[PDB]
Amino acid sequence: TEYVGDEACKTCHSDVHSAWSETSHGNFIKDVTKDPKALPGNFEGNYPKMLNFKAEDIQYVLLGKPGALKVQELVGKKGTFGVPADDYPVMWASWDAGKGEWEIEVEAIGEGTPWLSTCAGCHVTGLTVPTDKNPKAAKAFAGFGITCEQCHGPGAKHIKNPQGEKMVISYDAENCGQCHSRGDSVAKTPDGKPFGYPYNDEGQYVPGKKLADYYTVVSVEGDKEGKLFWPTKHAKNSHHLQYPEWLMTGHATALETLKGNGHAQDRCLKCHSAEAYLAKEGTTVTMNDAKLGVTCQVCHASHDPAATKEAFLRKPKTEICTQCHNAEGGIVAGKEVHHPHKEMNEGKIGLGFPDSPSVMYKAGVTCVDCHMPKTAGPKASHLMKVVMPKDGKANGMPDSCSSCHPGASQDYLQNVIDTWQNDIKGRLAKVKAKLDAKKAAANSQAYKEALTYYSIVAADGSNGVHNYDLAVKLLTAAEQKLQ
Amino acid sequence: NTEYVGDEACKTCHSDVHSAWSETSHGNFIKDVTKDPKALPGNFEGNYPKMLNFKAEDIQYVLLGKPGALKVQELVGKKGTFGVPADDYPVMWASWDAGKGEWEIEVEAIGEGTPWLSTCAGCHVTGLTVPTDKNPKAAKAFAGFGITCEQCHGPGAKHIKNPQGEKMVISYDAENCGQCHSRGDSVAKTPDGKPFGYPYNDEGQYVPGKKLADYYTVVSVEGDKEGKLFWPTKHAKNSHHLQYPEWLMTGHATALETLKGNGHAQDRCLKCHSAEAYLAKEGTTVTMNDAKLGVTCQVCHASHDPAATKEAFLRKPKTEICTQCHNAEGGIVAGKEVHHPHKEMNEGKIGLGFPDSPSVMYKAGVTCVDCHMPKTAGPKASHLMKVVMPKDGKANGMPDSCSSCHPGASQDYLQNVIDTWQNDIKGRLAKVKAKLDAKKAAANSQAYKEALTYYSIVAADGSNGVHNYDLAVKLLTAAEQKLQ
Ligand code: HEC
Numbered sequence: 007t008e009y010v011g012d013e014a015c016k017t018c019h020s021d022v023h024s025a026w027s028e029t030s031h032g033n034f035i036k037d038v039t040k041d042p043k044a045l046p047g048n049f050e051g052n053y054p055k056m057l058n059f060k061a062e063d064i065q066y067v068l069l070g071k072p073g074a075l076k077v078q079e080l081v082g083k084k085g086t087f088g089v090p091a092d093d094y095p096v097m098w099a100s101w102d103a104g105k106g107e108w109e110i111e112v113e114a115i116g117e118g119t120p121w122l123s124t125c126a127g128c129h130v131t132g133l134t135v136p137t138d139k140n141p142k143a144a145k146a147f148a149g150f151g152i153t154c155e156q157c158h159g160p161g162a163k164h165i166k167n168p169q170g171e172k173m174v175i176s177y178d179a180e181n182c183g184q185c186h187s188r189g190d191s192v193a194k195t196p197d198g199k200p201f202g203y204p205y206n207d208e209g210q211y212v213p214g215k216k217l218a219d220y221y222t223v224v225s226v227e228g229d230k231e232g233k234l235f236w237p238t239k240h241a242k243n244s245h246h247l248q249y250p251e252w253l254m255t256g257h258a259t260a261l262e263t264l265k266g267n268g269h270a271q272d273r274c275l276k277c278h279s280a281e282a283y284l285a286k287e288g289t290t291v292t293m294n295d296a297k298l299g300v301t302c303q304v305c306h307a308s309h310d311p312a313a314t315k316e317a318f319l320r321k322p323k324t325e326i327c328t329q330c331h332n333a334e335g336g337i338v339a340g341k342e343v344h345h346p347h348k349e350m351n352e353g354k355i356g357l358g359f360p361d362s363p364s365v366m367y368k369a370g371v372t373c374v375d376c377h378m379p380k381t382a383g384p385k386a387s388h389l390m391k392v393v394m395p396k397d398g399k400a401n402g403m404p405d406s407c408s409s410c411h412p413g414a415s416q417d418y419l420q421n422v423i424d425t426w427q428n429d430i431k432g433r434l435a436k437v438k439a440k441l442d443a444k445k446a447a448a449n450s451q452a453y454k455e456a457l458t459y460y461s462i463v464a465a466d467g468s469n470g471v472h473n474y475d476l477a478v479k480l481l482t483a484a485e486q487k488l489q
Numbered sequence: 490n491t492e493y494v495g496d497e498a499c500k501t502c503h504s505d506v507h508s509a510w511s512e513t514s515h516g517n518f519i520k521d522v523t524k525d526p527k528a529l530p531g532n533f534e535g536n537y538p539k540m541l542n543f544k545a546e547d548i549q550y551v552l553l554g555k556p557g558a559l560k561v562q563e564l565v566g567k568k569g570t571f572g573v574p575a576d577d578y579p580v581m582w583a584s585w586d587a588g589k590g591e592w593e594i595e596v597e598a599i600g601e602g603t604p605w606l607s608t609c610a611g612c613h614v615t616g617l618t619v620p621t622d623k624n625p626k627a628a629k630a631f632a633g634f635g636i637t638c639e640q641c642h643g644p645g646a647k648h649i650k651n652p653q654g655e656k657m658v659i660s661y662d663a664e665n666c667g668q669c670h671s672r673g674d675s676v677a678k679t680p681d682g683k684p685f686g687y688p689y690n691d692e693g694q695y696v697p698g699k700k701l702a703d704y705y706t707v708v709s710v711e712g713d714k715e716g717k718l719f720w721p722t723k724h725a726k727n728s729h730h731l732q733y734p735e736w737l738m739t740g741h742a743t744a745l746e747t748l749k750g751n752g753h754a755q756d757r758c759l760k761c762h763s764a765e766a767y768l769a770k771e772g773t774t775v776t777m778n779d780a781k782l783g784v785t786c787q788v789c790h791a792s793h794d795p796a797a798t799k800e801a802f803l804r805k806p807k808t809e810i811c812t813q814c815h816n817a818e819g820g821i822v823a824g825k826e827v828h829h830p831h832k833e834m835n836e837g838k839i840g841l842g843f844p845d846s847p848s849v850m851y852k853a854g855v856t857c858v859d860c861h862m863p864k865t866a867g868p869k870a871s872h873l874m875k876v877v878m879p880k881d882g883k884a885n886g887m888p889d890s891c892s893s894c895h896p897g898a899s900q901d902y903l904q905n906v907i908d909t910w911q912n913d914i915k916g917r918l919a920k921v922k923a924k925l926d927a928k929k930a931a932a933n934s935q936a937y938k939e940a941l942t943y944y945s946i947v948a949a950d951g952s953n954g955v956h957n958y959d960l961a962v963k964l965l966t967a968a969e970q971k972l973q
Pocket residue numbers: 256263264267269270271273274275276277278329330331332345465466467
């Protein structure tokens with residue numbers, strides 16, 4: 007094997023190894039025979055009678071340190087509970103650390119799921135398993151995930167000659183999509199079915215290669231029966247659909263959108279491209295060099311002590327969206343505004359208006375809460391799209407409003423949105439028609455101010471939901487200026 | 490040996506009552522699952538017995554045979570099994586939620602059933618005999634399944650023979666329900682000298698028409714030294730049946746006494762202040778001299794009436810159950826002081842030329858029950874009738890009146906909303922009261938009369954604006970404009 011494991015990298019990359027160690031990636035697998043303290047959950051007294059197994063039966067825990075994610079699975083000792091002798095049983099009871107309680111799949115009591123043939127392509131390095139090309143192959147792996155070489159490729163040649171043998175740094179979403187997806191392998195099992203993890207002739211996905219050569223990811227189109235995505239396209243299945251969701255978002259096409267536009271320059275790339283966003287202090291990135299949109303790596307830091315403990319965000323949840331979704335350089339009377347989302351919600355637009363933050367802004371609600379609704383169990387949707395309460399009702403799905411407002415009905419909450427939006431859509435139609443009609447007076451100061459007031463509300467794109475009273479105040483002031 | 494004849498005996502003469510009682514969860518509380526296998530709830534198929542550590546064949550009864558408002562179903566195993574005495578039954582260690590649709594397992598009691606008759610069944614069956622320290626010899630037995638007619642009306646043997654000559658008990662007294670809907674110690678004791686958890690004396694169980702205190706010392710805030718049963722606010726903490734101890738601490742329990750202490754008391758008043766008057770059938774008169782009881786359980790809950798709500802047997806819908814009494818309907822006139830305009834304040838219908846201004850929460854479907862009966866003890870609505878302020882929610886780690894509907898807001902945020910509203914309204918009320926006292930000489934004027942009434946709506950409402958903040962402000966603003 008060419009995989010040397012994480013300990014090899016601590017000497018030369020001391021800080022990165024330390025920061026990686028604190029991440030839940032870095033604590034994903036614990037050997038509980040070597041480290042009994044790491045085995046979570048209560049096995050004391052009668053618990054074994056309920057569980058139908060005991061502490062001594064367990065070899066590993068999956069999710070060794072909880073972060074944002076909290077449910078911990080157990081892998082039993084090799085060969086036990088009905089699995090082949092060269093594989094391990096994933097157990098039928100998981101521990102919810104955050105809730106502090108066992109969760110038992112009753113139908114699988116006694117019958118462990120084979121770990122390596124079902125799961126471990128997303129969990130370990132250098133995995134070999136029997137395929138229909140190699141039915142004979144022995145089941146084995148090199149090292150525990152989620153580790154350096156899974157995101158940077160094998161380290162053997164690099165540890166010998168660091169300057170001469172380069173590792174892969176990928177800002178590509180595929181670097182994360184190799185695990186943060188569902189899909190079928192190109193390879194097949196001895197029985198002719200696909201694996202649930204990336205796998206081809208050559209084995210697992212390797213950073214620097216094309217994911218499609220190893221893995222066909224699930225999609226809204228491929229999910230004929232609506233088992234994985236809701237009709238809104240948000241993830242339904244709790245299990246890891248961030249990448250398939252992300253592919254449907256503007257973030258994925260952020261750089262392409264910039265290229266298609268006539269006014270594109272190098273200034274723009276900071277908000278539209280990962281390479282530019284993640285360029286270190288002196289470096290230049292140019293329209294020709296940039297290839298990628300707003301990928302996972304823009305929002306998530308794989309090993310940085312400044313990142314948040316849960317979900318490794320590069321900035322706090324309050325800033326993670328506003329960093330790009332602002333109009334900071336461009337709120338001036340006479341100029342049209344682009345995406346003033348930060349400013350609209352917090353109510354800081356200048357132009358002589360005092361600060362009028364929305365009620366929800368003052369109550370601590372932020373972009374993430376409405377635009378990343380928990381549509382798949384406890385997981386925040388990466389579609390970035392609001393689930394309207396009507397669709398919450400129509401599909402029996404969680405929505406952007408009802409989790410914070412369980413006292414209100416979905417029809418009540420939808421009526422709030424429609425009342426706000428119909429009012430603001432109307433005023434926007436009037437003021438736009440008045441601005442077009444009086445185009446000849448464009449040079450006047452009154453018109454310039456009305457154009458900008460109108461543009462804040464329009465370009466915001468929420469039709470008032472972000473800050474209803476400010477939207478009204480602005481479009482009222484726009485019409486006063488227009489006579 | 491027993492005077493208890495069971496419910497079937499009453500069906501012939503009281504056909505409608507028996508039918509209505511049959512649909513109540515009282516009437517379906519115990520099912521024999523050997524005689525009726527369909528009645529056994531929960532999943533025993535496949536591997537479930539390996540998890541549960543028992544099987545369907547081990548079960549004799551189900552407690553809570555029909556779910557209503559209450560949803561968790563318990564199982565009683567076959568006689569003598571799982572570690573209990575040979576003359577008693579094991580209450581099992583796994584309950585079925587049904588509302589959730591899932592098992593709930595007390596892991597510590599796997600293998601060890603709790604003895605049903607000596608621990609529980611005084612609240613569940615008629616004619617219960619168990620060994621006491623007076624009669625250690627007595628054999629454990631019972632007459633009939635609860636929750637049945639004779640538990641609320643007394644034994645039926647003599648009455649079925651001679652209906653007109655041998656009267657049954659109808660009680661509007663809260664004790665009629667408090668005999669089960671409480672926690673406390675029996676006056677009787679076990680062979681070991683401990684009290685039973687159900688009413689029991691020398692003569693056995695509580696009988697309707699007798700005084701509960703002769704059989705049972707109910708728990709109280711004062712008796713609960715260690716705060717295991719009540720929160721510091723006095724609301725129930727323990728999920729298990731504390732409606733009666735809660736009810737005793739409320740004005741509803743003293744509603745008739747309050748009326749008697751007042752000088753202007755008349756027979757008109759009794760409809761809102763007394764059970765006998767409230768429940769008086771078409772024709773009957775109730776007078777200050779006849780009425781003995783306040784606003785008891787029986788005012789709000791109907792024991793067998795097809796017009797009641799299916800869950801909790803409410804006599805009126807949750808939207809009307811409080812407003813029926815908490816209104817000022819006959820008394821909003823300029824110049825007169827208003828009394829308890831709670832309905833009117835919340836819905837914003839006060840007349841006096843003002844258009845309708847219902848509060849935001851009124852328009853959003855919030856009602857008295859939601860704020861005043863917060864679920865402080867698991868899924869059970871508190872009968873203390875008192876709001877739990879979010880500060881006390883935070884300070885004690887208890888559910889509060891606001892956070893369940895507003896989980897997005899912090900408890901400090903929600904308390905600040907209340908204090909902002911209340912401090913504003915308390916201030917305006919202090920100004921307008923001082924101005925009304927000061928200009929007492931101008932009392933005959935139309936302006937003053939209207940300001941007195943506006944002030945009185947907001948003051949007598951007693952919420953200091955929480956019921957409808959904007960209306961409170963509008964009224965006290967209008968009161969001060971009139972006082973210029
Ligand atoms: C350079 C000077 C720039 C050009 C040319 C463009 N941008 Fe941006 N951008 C940003 C956000 C958050 C959005 C989404 C806004 C929304 O959906 O409301 C955009 C969008 C665009 C678009 C249109 C795509 C669409 O309709 O959604 C174009 C053509 C475009 N951008 C070109 C963020 C930022 C940003 C953050 C600080 C900067 C500096 C720029 N964009 C700069 C440019």
